[PDB]
Structure 1
Amino acid sequence: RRLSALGPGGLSRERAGLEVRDVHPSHYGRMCPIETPEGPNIGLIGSLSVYARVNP
């Protein structure tokens, strides 16, 4: 259920500003604001919310 930020065609780690890592107001009900890594990957690895679902 993870939502990763890095990868080809995504953003790279040297471009990982502090603002992509913040909890965005649009995450409410989609990406859990609590579960994220403490270390370097903070705000880059988030997990899908309980009732959330991806559309086509």
Structure 2
Amino acid sequence: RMERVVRERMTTQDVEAITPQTLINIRPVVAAIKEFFGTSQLSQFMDQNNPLSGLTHKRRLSALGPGGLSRERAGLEVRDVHPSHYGRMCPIETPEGP
């Protein structure tokens, strides 16, 4: 987004008069970072009711996300335990809900 704005004004602005200070816009970059960290289903609230939960909410693998399979498309097919999970993803722990 920043780049599109930059290249847009890179023609309109007069030459021999401009500088990266006058060219760059950081508003969309900071907005993108803020909109990620707040209000994104991966920037989850720290679930720390006990130290173990504090640890385990980290190291957690979530297959649902943006660029990911929501429960609508995340059917049974991907919910099984392929034999490649051994040593790479525990077969036991997983939320009992949907």
TM-score by length of 2: 0.39
Which residue matches 2:62?
4
Q: What percentage of residue pairs aligned between the two structures are identical?
A: 100
Looking at CA atoms only, which structure, 1 or 2, has the larger radius of gyration? 2
Runs of 4+ in 1 over 2 A off after TM superposition: none
In 2, distance between residues paired with 1:38 and 1:13? 14
Report the RMSD for the aligned CA atoms in angstroms. Answer: 0.7
Report deviation, 1:14: 0.2
Report deviation, 1:13: 1.4
Q: Where in structure 2 are there 5+ consecutive unaligned residues?
A: 1-58
In 2, distance between residues paired with 1:25 and 1:19? 14
In 2, distance between residues paired with 1:37 and 1:12? 15
TM-score by length of 1: 0.66
- Matched residue pairs, number? 40
Choose which of 31, 35, 38 in structure 1 pairs with 2:96. Answer: 38
Deviations 1:2-42 (A, max 9, x none): 000101011121001102111111101000000011110xx
Q: Where in structure 1 are there 5+ consecutive unaligned residues?
A: 41-56
Q: Which has the higher contact order (CA 8 A, sep 6+)?
A: 1
